[PDB]
Every structure is written in structure tokens, then in C-alpha cells.
Symmetry: D2
Subunit: 393 residues, 4 copies
């Protein structure tokens, strides 16, 4: 049997340091010395291994990358200095003016604007559609279609998308790449390549680093395509070069990934169920609910049902502000996936950049509240919510 | 009188830390806690100051930014996670399919690829010209021209370009931006806005950090434009987000920037003079030489002549490899601007990515060597060249 | 009710950062600016709060300190740059030539040397006894006795020591301090002040940081005593000043301390049971065994039974080397308490500094192996032991 | 010729990393993996090279150490987590109850209390005398004398001590070790072993790191004595283990040591001379003054006259507070040796811990002001002083 995920977030891609450091050292160096001119020109030509310069590759960054590639069961991984840089380095390597991209319409807010406003201006065409309806991706393909893109569960309604059926329709013509943002599951919950996906991206900012102190992105997929994302999309187009220091912080955060993912998913099931029972609460979205739309597809794709919860209060937006301003243990902030529980209001904060219409066409409402459950004691978490929620009743 | 450069690289844009920390702390945090929901919505809407999320701004990175904006005399500065990222976020926010771009043909290798290959698949038109020749700029101006771009001295030949002349030609038409990559000078030798330039970019991986351990970029210019570059170039298109830990290190490196540039320049003039006298060397390009073409222009534009030297051996390619393989003190690696002296072979190494005819048209021959002098003892530096060179003869 | 341990390792001693940073910043500053001379003189005289100089206190190190003091229920905590430094600063502030010290003979190797060799050249008297035997403490008490010291479970045999009994004997005379090294439990399994202990020390290089990349110590106890240890032990005698960067990393590591200790313990009980059943093993010392001597005491004193296991092979010294040289998943190195499982041979490695008769009197034989279980998959851990062990037979 | 100091703060003790990192990586690891049991027991026995555990030694820390050892022309160097830890690890390895220590009476304030109050309590005898008078060390020796200790120039009056004459008297009986704290000169200004000293210590906090963000100490001297300071004074007594991260910050700061020392010494000569001419100023102490006491000995021992200045205003202590509170570029804080200029009042701040009598017996007055000149533009520095000083007249 393959190393388990639990063992592998600590031991996959073992490094060999010359002094036998238990924890591989930090390669904070912009540049690497050649033994001679012929070796440097050989590396430059892609004909000899070894390092050259940190925008092109770095040993600490490669350690993280081979550990992520193993956990995602992909041939290679390229690390970048933010989830947006991973998204952008991948699609601006693959696309040129005249190509076509299809995307799910419920996306993180900044992915939506990269697709809607920048790819648009570089002559690329995009469709935003609900990729969860059976058949919509095939109805929107054209000869020139190159990428189909989605996030599941989606940020932030937690909509579920049947990846395998999206793939089957996208690969029904040649030359189409399916890209899935797996930030909200992490590689402990889902491996998108299992279902036909070609490329898997992450905001490592969230669960993978898990400690709210690093911004970073990851690209996982085949070696030859990622070699072109490295030499074109990283080298030249985005310049999104992860600091070797932050890469070594994310390997450190990775090694408790499996224990954090289980504990956050167990705490989140308790909290979502508590919330769903409270009288001030109207509606709770959580992929583990049997009444969730796409539950059954979520169960086939997800090993655990995650730590994201989204819910709506019967007091709407003003109720939301009150709950939120009065919480004491839960933290008001954007981002998600850390050890501590965070909460925010997506229409005034993360999805504010997307025009209301476009929000609501996707299902983003003005009363939604988005919660990312940490590893605090579940009863204290429920109790912070009880006190905030009782105050609205 | 303005705070001098030598004081300002330590004291411009002073911080106010609540504990009075002498060295402002490292914000190695991905996100920021709102006091209440309103403040959150306000910050997102640009109505209230404060921090939100490290892809969008962070106090350690603002400190470095305001210190560089002061030193380049610009209203603002945006820091990035590589010099390519500063260039790309800059030109990808400005241009859109259909615009036109004029650049100096002699550029860093990687920028030339971005501009020849990337830009052009995005529907941008590009021409590479000699902006150092009177009239070439105005003759290539087109109605859709948006950027005129160049480096002086140029990488790797050290060509001098008359900034003031290029700017008056580019700005003879409305709506053009002149962008100068000021890496090789640093804000201590040149402030390109003094000459009419509108946007100044840097690879802060070179002299500004000065310690060869950080890869980062900087963008300097008007608040208006740089707010657009921060919300579009950085936030969505490149995702080139600097690590706060690396920003702090650059800030640190920045504080010796004045004494390192003077000491590097002093050393360089001695080493350049020594190379010039040596019978194995055909040519030495240095901006301080009296005969260096554009020496009066170099003199009006540079407070110091820099630590870059480029030279060509009479034995060409095979003599350059021999000399670079027997150097014992000067270090063989790409990059430049560190405390230690570095050297490389442009044609096979930093510019091997440029089709040979383009290198040749810009004067990059295969007998050419590029040297960045650091702060070792100038007599030990000359002695390394003496033994290596005498072994050639 | 008190904030639970599981919440408090993330939220006790909350910080107030001026920008609302989610993760309080790294004060990597040696010194602090006074607003005026008076405030400077006031701070130095203890009349005004604030910071002066990182040998004397730093906000990142106070944050870690107050979080540990909360978790051990002590009024204060002083962090140091190694577990030895916490022990030394502690006992060197208390004692003076002429005092007497009583310690458990089974100690970490290095503490035993400090106490047998260092203390005694300084004119301190020391006796090493079995504090686990009823009456030994009171029988060695002397009028000049100042400290009674011990570790439970002990390093490396896992002897349990009845804290409550040792404290009532030591405190039957006035003026004695009981000091417990709580490293092997961590504040999540045991709070030794609950039992009458007066001073709790840790090697935070072990479970509290939990990631094997930091060497640091902690001292926990009354404000009075620890103010003396900070101004004398730390400031003048040891100079064991923690790096703010390493403090911040420990804080970071601390936030998973609860889920790592539970997961380590769960794993350990399975691995200990497996070793116990194996025909090549003569004996397994684990605190959770029903037959483990002092299992009722271990049970009153520990919330979990820990991840330390010590075992003796029926083949002695030569069988221990063979097994430790063919282990593929468990890592051979000294130290313990990390996410990865570590193992070593006490007699030739952590305790080889102890004259052999003293090791032997404390039960350290040469067939003994010490194991610290981490958070890998328990079935892969047992399978490594199975192949290594079966190769012995 | 030996590598010059200028070249050697960058290139002495060159490291060989397996990937040819231009800047050796950071070994942030508590622990090192053995290839087998026999290798670990061999290292533990001092019979085989390689690493074991970071309290005992670490490759990044060793890089700094060999670079300091080369610049101080000593066989070895041991790095510690504060200057006090270096002082204390050296003298608590060498001394035992019954020994005798002679020290100069003008010392940093915390060295004075370690000698006066802690060594005293561990049965060691100490004499505080003025070691600058010809003959005083010999008059105070006894059979049991083991160490003679001093700082020159002294902190903070800048008193000069003729090291060679102190050595000649201390080595006039066998078994005596001369220890000189060379913090205020740095190895660019003085090598104390030139004059007969056996052991040289530093607060690396000051000039050597040079960037006010690291607390650390260094011990330089023979290999066999430093091997005992490592295995006893570091391992066991002080536990003063430098973080490998801060050691790599101090190597980074080291590489501009020679350019910073020259620039701070040139700026300090200008500033001291300016101060000496101002009408509100009464007395200025600067080793470069020809009327300094011990000038001629300072000239033989010091290559440059340093950046420390101490001066007294005719308005005494209240004048001091006013000047200081009104300075704008100079920073009010303790510590010294950074890139930025710092200033403080030694009797209410650094030497307040020493009883007035003892201060003044040494020459510390209540009007002294102690300044450590950075690398700002000298005219702006003089101008900040002019504006503060004119306000007193
Ligand atoms: C699903 C998902 N993708 C991408 C990102 C962007 O990653 P980052 O914020 O690291 O650029 C976020 C926010 C996210 O929620
Ligand atoms: C002149 C020039 N600017 C841009 C770059 C790219 O900077 P970076 O290597 O930091 O991406 C470099 C190299 C450079 O030399
Ligand atoms: C129980 C005990 N405390 C003290 C020490 C010493 O801690 P450090 O190695 O951090 O100096 C260790 C190892 C330890 O095991
Ligand atoms: C001469 C000198 N020695 C030692 C120290 C103490 O070093 P640190 O503050 O790093 O412990 C200082 C202050 C100093 O001025």
C-alpha cells in the first residue's frame, strides 16, 4: 500500500541533507553557484539538473512541492506566492487571445474578477455557468474551448459539483484541460485527479499551511504542463515566486494537516448541527447535511465533510452584523482554514468585488455568514454562538 | 532641505510601533481582525484605512514601500515577490489587447521574453528598438502606443539611454507612459522621475536587498496608477505577493544601501580600470569611463557609476569559460548586486533565452562577460582577475 | 468555568496589535525606543511598564509566556533559549554555596551532570535519591535543604513519582521548593502545581513546540520567584535569552499542542500494546499499562498517558542496535515530542554522559530503548516495528 | 597574505552546500538523524564528527563561529544567545568555589552584577580594580587567581586599558586566563590576542550583527578551552543556545561589518569634534582625541577609533534630559552598534543597576551621555545635535 496521507504529510518526499538535519534547512538564497561555466549553461538549457536561481526553483520549495504532489497523487507541483498567482500562472500559461474558458459561476471573488475582467482584456473569452447542472459544460463548448474551471465545494455557498461528469463533458473534445480549485477540501479530503481533473490548484494560505501566517498557492498536475507553467507563467508572466522561508513554514504546517483536517471537520459537524437547531437561525449549508444539494456527490468526492459552514439568520443582514460583532471566541476576519475559527459576511467582505447581481445569480445572499471552524473545544464554540444568537431572540 | 539618501535609507517613512520597537516587527500574518462588521465593509469599500488581507497590503510591506517611494521621489510604491512580478503587474495592468508597446531591445533576458512572447499572445503589439538613437522612439510611435520601456544602463551591455530625450519623444503624443527599470542603479545613483519617467521598476533581489537571499520586486510611481496595479496587477493578475518576512529582510538590507553602493562603485572603478589595461581583454564597458559612449549622459543621470562592469575577452567564448572557471574569489552564478562579487556569461546564461540574432543585434556577443562588483578588498579582487587572466595568456 | 486547554493553547493571553493582525507580529528587535528619558529611568526602576531590551523582556516572548503560564495555572512564566537554561536559571537563582539540593536520581542526562558536577563545584550539596520511595525525601532533608527536584514520568525509564507525597514531605520543613520537570507530559496532560509543586520547568524544544525545529525552555511558577529568575538567572547568570523568532514559532507550534498530544497518546497506547505482545521484547514501560507500577498515581496525575514508551529487548545491547538500524519509518536521533516518531539508545546516547553505575542504579540498562511516538498512521508505525523486530528473530 | 578583514567578513570559512546555495541555508532543526547507532554513540563520545543536537552544535551556527574565529585570529569560537551568556559560559566553566577573579571596575552594568553578586554566591572571590594603572593587576594576584577580565574601551566612559601590560602581569604566575570583552571595537578594530589575551568575548548584539534585531554573544579562543566551554558552560550551566535563525541573521549582518565600522568611525570623529566645540557641551570623551587618557595605547590597539562617544553637558542631568528628549534623528534607546545612531543616559538606564558609589568610583557620572554613531549623513547628525544643543543655550 501507498504511504497513508497521515504518514505522508510528515514523511512523503524525504530530503537528504548532508548533515542529516531532522528538518531540512531553509534555502533563503536568491542564487546558486555553478561549479563551472558548462554546468550553468547546461542547466539553463534544461539539459542538466541542479538549481540556478530562486524565481526558477529552490530546494526548500521543491521539498514542499514533492510532498503536495504526492498527497494529490499528481506527477508534479509548482508553488507560488499566492493562491491567485497559482490560478493566474496556470491559465495565462495555457491561454492566448482567441481561446475560450468555461468556469463555474460561483467562485471566490478575486478568481471571478481575474476571469471576468483581465482574461477578457487579453482577448480570451469566458463563460460563467452553473457547472453543477448535468450537461451545461457541453452546451457551452466551442472548437476553441481550452479550459473548464470550478471549485467544489464553492466559495462561499458550498455548492457541490460533480467533477467526473464535468470532466466527461470537457474531455468530449480534444485538447481541453479541467482545472479544479481544491482549496476548501485540501488533499486530505479529496483528490480531484481521481475524477478526471487534469490540474488541481490551491490557496495554500488556507488549510495546507493551516496557521494564518503565510500567503501562498500551489499547482498540481502533470510534469510537462507544470514545466511550462514554471518557465512561462511563473518565470515571465506572474513573477509569483514563493519565499523559501514561507515554503518551509507551509511544510511545517503541513505536518499537522491530517490531524487538523479531522479535528476541524469533527468540530464543524457539531457546530453546524447546533446552528441548524437555533431559533434565530434560518438556513444552514454544510455538505454533510443529508438535505444538502449534491450531498450524495459530496459523499463520493469528500472523505470528510470539511470545516466550512455557511448560514443565514432570520434577521438578515442586520442580524448578521450583530451576531458577528458580539462573538467572543470566533474571530472576525477574512480567510479561513486556520487553527482558530474565523467568520465573515461575504457580500460586504470577500465577494463585495463581485457585482450584487452576479453574486445573487450565483446564490450569494446579503444575509449569508461564512464560518471556517478551527480546533477549539466544540462546546466553547457552541457557547460563543449561543450567547450571540440568544441576543437576537 | 530633503532628508538625504544616506539618512533616509534608514529613517524615511518611520513607523509607530505600540511598544516602541526599534526595528518594526514582522507582520507574518495572512489576515487582520476587524473590530466590527462595519469597519470590515468600510475597509473593503476604500472608505476606511487599515488592513485586511496580506495579498492586499500588510504593515511590514507598507513600511518597505514608503521607504522606497521616498528614495525614488515617487508618490507610492508597490512591492512584489520578484522583479518579473513588478514588471508584469505593471505592464499587465496598463495594457489590453490592441495596445502597442515600445521597448529597448537590450533588456534583461526574461523581460524580453515576457514582452516578445507573452504580451504578443495577448494581442498586444510590441517593437524592440534602440531607444538610445535619436528619433527611433518618435518614429515608432503609433496611435495605440501606451508604454515606452527601457533599462539604463542596459542588462547586460551597460548601454546608456538618454532618459530625458526618450521621455520628451514618448510624451510628444498624449497618453504614453515611460517605464524605466532602475535596478542597476538603485535609487541611490538615479531617480528616473527626475527625467520625466512615469513608472520606475526594480528587481529588489539585486542591490536594494543587497544580500542575495531574497527575490522581490518594486514598483514606484503615482498613487493613481499604483492603486490600479495593486488592485488589478497584484490582486488578480499576477498574485505576486511579497512575504512580509522577505519585505522585512529587504528593509534591513536597505539600511546599508548607501554605504554598499558607494563601496561597490569605488571598487568597480578600480576593477574596471584594471580590466581595461589588460592585454587579454578587448573591450570594457563601464559608465565611469571618459570614452564610454554616453558618459556625459551617464554623468548627468547617475550620482555614482555603479558596480556593474561588462567586458569582452580577445579569445571569445572559449577564453571566457576558462577565465570564469579559474576565478577563486569572484563567484560564478547569475544575479548581481550582492555584497559578494558575482560574474556570469550572458549569452549562455541570463540571455540564452533570447534568440541569438536578437542578442547579437543588441551587442550581446559570446565573448562578453558581466560582473557585479561587491565589497571585498579591491586589490584581492584585481588579484583574482590577474591570476585568472594571466593563465589565459 | 476556566477556558479549556484545547481552546487556550490557541486563545489564552490574547494580544492587542495596533493593526489587528490575526497572528501577532515577530518583535525581532534587540531594543526599544523610549518616548522620553523619564520613561526610560522609570522602566529601568520597575515603576513603569513597557519594554527596554530583549535580554530583559520582549512582547513576542511575553505572549508565549502568558499562554504557558495560563496552561500550567501558574502566575508567571519565563521563557529561555533551552530546557537546560530554564533549569539552570532556576536553580542558579535559588541556590548559593552552602545550600542543599535533593533530586531524583533518574533525570535527563544533562540535568544530572549539571547537578552532580556544576552545582557541586559551586559549593552546593546535592544527593540523588529515589523520590518514588516513601520516606526517602524526608530522610534526606537537611536544615539547609532548598530544592527538591524530579521528573515524572522520568527520562528515560518512565518511573512515576507521587507528586503529592513528595511535596508534603519536602514542605514538612519550611523554605523548601519542589521543582518538577513537566516536559514529558506538557501542560496538556499534567499541571504539577495541582499537587503542591512550586516551580514547573520544560524543555519546550520537545512537545510544546512539537516540530523539532526549536530549542527553548520554560519556567512556570509565582510572580515573585520568577521575577528574581528573570533579573538574576536570565539577565546575569545564564544569558539564556530566547530569540523572538523562535518564541513566535513555539507559539505557533503550541496552537496544535492539544490535538498533537491526544493523537500522540492514542498512537502510543497502540504501539506500546504491540511491543508488549512481541516475543523479542522483555519489558515495556508505558504509563497507561494496568500493571505499570504507579499506574494509579499516573492515572491521578495525567489526563493522557503520553507518547513516550521505553522498552528492553531480550537480546540486550546488540539486539537494540540491530532493531534501531533497520527501522524505516521511525527516526533515529535524540530529542522527542515532535510530529515525527523518534527513537534512541539512552545508555549510549542521551545518558552516556552519566557514569554507568548511576545509570544502572536508576534502571537505565543497555538493552533499553526510548521511543517518542508522533502522529503517523499507528498501523504503519507498528508495521515498522514488526519488520525490524521479526528480523531480530 | 591572509585574506583581508574586508574580504573575510563575506568569504572566510566558506561553506559547501550540496546544491551550491550562494548563501548557506538555515538549519532551524533541534535535532540530527544518525545513519546508525554506532555513529550516534561515536559522536556522543567525541570520537566522530557530525551533528547531534542544536544545544551541542549546529551547522549554521558553526558557519558564523568559523567566520568570527578567523576575524579574531583565534582557533575557535562558540556562539551563545546573548553577550551575558558568553561571559557567563566562559567564567562558570573556568571557575569553581575557592577561585579568584580580577576585573577592571568599569564594566557594562550587567557584567558587574554577575561578577559582584552571582560569582560571589558560588564561593568565588572577585576584586574590582582599575586595571589601567600600571602594576594594579599584579598587586592583587593570589595563588588562587584564575582570570583577569576587562573591557577596552570601557562601557561607558571609554577608558583605555593597555592590554599587553595587563597580560604580562597576569601571566607572571601560571594558570591565569586573560579575558577581554571586545564588543566596543569589534574584530575590525582590534584583535585582543595580538596583545597576549587568551579569550575574547563579544555581545554580538552590537556591531557584529549591526542591525539591532538580534541578541547574541560570542566566545573566541583556543579549541580545547572552548570545547570545555561548549560541553560544560553551554550544555549544562547556562543553556545559552543561539537560535540558528539568529546566527544566520548575524552572518548576514557580518558581511557589511567592515564598511559599517569604517563609516561609523568616520561619522563619529566628525560628530565628536562638533560636540566638543559646542558651548553647551562641557566635556567629550572619544579615544581618537589626542587629549584622551590612554590615547597612545588606544592608537596602538585600535585600527579605527570606534563609534562610541560619551559627553557631559554643562547643564548636567537636567540638561541631558532635555537634549535627549528633543533629538529628532538620533534614537533614544539602550544598546549600541547599529546602523542607526542611538543615545542614552547611563546612570538611569544601562548602569542604574550598579550602585551610585560604585559608578562614580569608576568614573560614571550623572551627567554622562552615551552616543553610538550610525551611518546616517554626518551633517544631518550634527544638525540634529545643533538644534537640541542650541535650545539649552
Ligand atoms: C477557493 C480559494 N481560492 C483561491 C483563493 C485565493 O488564494 P490567496 O488568497 O492565497 O491568493 C482563495 C481566497 C480561496 O478561497
Ligand atoms: C534589470 C532587471 N530587472 C528585472 C529582473 C528580474 O528580477 P527578478 O529576478 O527579481 O524576477 C532582473 C534580473 C534584472 O536584472
Ligand atoms: C526532561 C528534560 N528536560 C530538560 C531537557 C533539556 O532541554 P533542552 O534540550 O531544550 O536544553 C530535556 C532534553 C529533557 O528531556
Ligand atoms: C561591553 C558589552 N558587553 C556585554 C554586553 C551584554 O551583551 P548582551 O546585551 O547581548 O547580553 C553589553 C551590553 C556590552 O555593552
Amino acid at each position: 500500500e501507498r504511504m497513508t496521507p497521515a504518514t505522508a504529510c510528515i514523511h512523503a518526499n524525504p530530503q537528504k541533507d548532508q548533515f542529516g538535519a531532522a528538518i531540512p534547512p531553509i534555502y533563503q538564497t536568491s542564487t546558486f553557484v555553478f561549479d563551472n561555466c558548462q554546468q550553468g549553461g547546461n542547466r539553463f538549457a534544461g539539459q542538466e539538473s541542479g538549481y540556478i536561481y530562486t524565481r526558477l526553483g529552490n530546494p526548500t520549495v521543491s521539498n514542499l512541492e514533492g510532498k503536495i504532489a504526492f498527497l494529490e497523487k499528481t506527477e508534479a507541483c509548482v508553488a507560488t506566492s499566492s493562491g491567485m498567482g497559482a490560478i493566474a500562472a496556470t491559465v495565462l500559461t495555457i491561454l492566448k487571445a482567441g481561446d475560450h474558458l468555461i468556469s463555474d459561476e460561483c467562485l471566490y471573488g478575486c478568481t471571478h474578477a481575474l476571469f471576468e475582467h483581465a482574461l477578457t482584456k487579453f482577448g480570451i473569452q469566458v463563460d460563467f455557468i452553473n457547472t453543477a447542472i448535468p450537461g451545461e459544460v457541453k452546451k457551452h463548448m466551442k472548437p476553441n474551448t481550452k479550459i473548464v474551471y470550478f471549485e467544489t465545494p464553492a466559495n462561499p455557498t458550498l455548492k457541490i459539483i460533480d467533477m467526473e461528469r464535468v470532466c466527461k463533458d470537457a474531455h468530449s473534445q480534444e485538447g481541453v484541460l479541467v482545472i479544479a480549485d481544491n482549496t476548501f477540501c485540501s488533499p486530505m479530503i479529496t483528490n480531484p485527479v481521481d475524477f478526471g481533473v487534469d490540474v488541481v490548484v490551491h490557496s495554500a494560505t488556507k488549510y495546507i499551511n493551516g496557521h494564518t501566517d503565510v500567503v501562498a498557492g500551489l499547482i498540481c498536475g502533470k510534469a510537462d504542463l507544470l514545466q511550462q507553467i514554471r518557465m512561462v507563467g511563473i518565470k515571465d508572466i506572474t513573477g509569483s515566486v514563493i519565499s523559501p522561508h514561507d515554503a518551509w513554514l507551509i511544510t511545517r504546517g503541513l505536518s499537522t494537516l491530517n490531524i487538523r483536517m479531522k479535528a476541524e471537520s469533527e468540530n464543524a459537524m457539531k457546530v453546524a448541527e447546533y446552528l441548524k437547531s437555533h431559533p434565530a437561525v434560518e438556513k444552514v449549508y454544510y455538505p454533510g447535511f443529508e438535505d444538502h444539494e449534491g450531498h450524495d456527490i459530496a459523499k463520493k468526492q469528500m472523505r470528510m465533510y470539511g470545516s466550512m459552514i455557511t448560514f443565514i439568520l432570520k434577521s438578515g443582514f442586520e442580524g448578521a452584523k450583530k451576531l458577528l460583532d458580539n462573538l467572543k471566541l470566533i474571530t472576525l476576519a477574512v480567510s479561513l482554514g486556520g487553527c482558530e475559527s474565523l467568520i465573515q459576511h461575504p457580500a460586504s467582505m470577500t465577494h463585495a468585488v463581485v457585482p450584487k447581481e452576479e453574486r445573487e445569480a450565483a446564490g450569494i445572499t446579503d444575509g449569508m455568514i461564512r464560518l471556517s471552524v478551527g480546533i477549539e473545544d466544540a462546546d466553547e464554540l457552541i457557547a460563543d454562538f449561543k450567547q450571540g444568537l440568544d441576543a437576537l431572540l
